Paper text:
Compounds 4–37 were screened crystallographically against CYP121A1 using soaking experiments. A number of hits (7, 10, 14, 21, 31 and 33) were identified, although the completeness of the electron density for the ligands was variable. All six of the X-ray crystallographic hits were ligands containing 7 as an integral subunit of molecular structure. X-ray crystal structures of compounds 10 and 21 with CYP121A1, whilst of better quality, still suffered from incomplete ligand electron density, either lacking complete density for the indole moiety (for 10) or lacking density for the central linker (for 21). Hydrogenation of 11 over palladium on carbon in ethanol in the presence of triethylamine yielded the known pyrimidine 10.
The utility of this method is illustrated by way of an XP Screen against CYP121A1, a cytochrome P450 enzyme from Mycobacterium tuberculosis (Mtb) championed as a validated drug discovery target. CYP121A1 (mycocyclosin synthase; EC 1.14.19.70; Rv2276), functioning downstream of the cyclo(l-tyrosyl-l-tyrosyl) (cYY) synthase (EC 2.3.2.21; Rv2275), catalyzes the conversion in Mtb of the cyclic dipeptide cYY into the highly strained biaryl-containing natural product mycocyclosin. Whilst the precise function of mycocyclosin remains unknown, ablation of CYP121A1 expression via genetic knockouts showed the enzyme to be essential for the viability of the bacterium in vitro; CYP121A1 is thus seen as an important target for anti-TB drug research. The CYP121A1 binding pocket has been shown by X-ray crystallography to accommodate ligands in three distinct regions (i) binding to the heme group, (ii) binding in the cYY region and (iii) binding at the top of the binding pocket.
Author numbering: 2 to 396
Write the structure that this text describes.
Amino acid sequence: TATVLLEVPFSARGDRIPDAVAELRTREPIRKVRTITGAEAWLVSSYALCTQVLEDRRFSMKETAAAGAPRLNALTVPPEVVNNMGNIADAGLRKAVMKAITPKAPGLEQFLRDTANSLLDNLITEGAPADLRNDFADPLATALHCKVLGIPQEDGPKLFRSLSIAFMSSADPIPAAKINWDRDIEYMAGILENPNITTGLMGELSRLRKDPAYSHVSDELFATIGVTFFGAGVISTGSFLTTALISLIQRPQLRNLLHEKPELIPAGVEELLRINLSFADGLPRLATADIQVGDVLVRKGELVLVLLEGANFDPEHFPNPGSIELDRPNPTSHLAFGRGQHFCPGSALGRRHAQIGIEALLKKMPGVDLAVPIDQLVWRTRFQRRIPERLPVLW
Ligand code: HEC
Ligand SMILES: c1ccc2c(CCc3ccncn3)c[nH]c2c1
Ligand SMILES: [Cl-]
């Protein structure tokens, strides 16, 4: 009997990789799929072909936003925002933005530790079960990014609540996304004019905005940087830490090891990054030329989806890919942060967020365990991240 073209994404579950991924990688590591919009795309699932695509700018991020292109999903932002990093670079702002979002600012790591410990103390006081997503990982991400941006902690929750819509992976445009986007842009425009905001990313952007060397950079770009980096950083660190905590809880031997030897936590987090399923969709690129990828000649104008867990569970690059092994020879060579032109600018901050969050959790609740059977986690659908709606634990 006839079947439709293979549809992506395969599963919204972030606690297991579908067997279909390895079968695809082995039989057809670049293969045609249908996205939720109905568009066809090339799904790339081997490490070698994923890196090839991400390292060839002729597979363009920016052009995925072009009118009439085959789409993975509907834009939730103005099309120029897809090229936000490119616009930042063209405005002469890349170095300043990068420096503002490193975890090395004085007191930043102590802020993370203090915040994590305070959130955990509150959970211990409230008593089990505790929701490690809504009452730990996401508030820690939100507090971190208010600090990094230089904006008041009390503004975090409202900005955060845009994100369950802003990072939707939808077949169609989302009216609420524009409502929240325009509102959050207005907020950050006000931040740039707010004399109290003198630290962090927005403090620096506010200064550069009045510097004659940036007098022709648009106010829209300055505001957009704030919304984009808050949203990307918070959704990415919150979702990654949440699904990392699941992987850690499901490995009590690793939890005990990292609890007893915290110096191993960075290597543990690198492996948790490698096996992380937080990205719900392949990374999209639009071909701007005819390009050979494996056995397929990708044609100009076609959509390519780089499946991160395809690369990161590829046994030809990461032997025994499903196992967390702290002594791999190539531990940071995973694609959790992408690769090439669009490699994540917040990679160092995301690493520190997770390392400190896990260190604090293991000290405060060494006996942490799921409080529900793992299958009972509710996996958010049609979203750019895989996350459980609640993460109930006991300890
Ligand atoms: C505070 C900012 C920030 C943080 C923190 C952050 N991201 Fe990023 N990330 C970005 C931005 C902005 C981009 C777009 C870069 C570009 O287009 O050049 C990006 C790009 C990426 C990409 C590549 C996307 C592509 O299409 O090539 C991946 C993958 C990624 N981030 C994953 C993560 C993960 C995983 C984490 C946490 C563990 C994280 N990011 C934390 C802001 C952030
Ligand atoms: C693929 C998907 C999304 C993006 C973005 C914007 C991400 C964002 C930020 C805040 N609210 C909503 N979305 C920039 N480059 C991208 C590539
Ligand atoms: Cl504050």
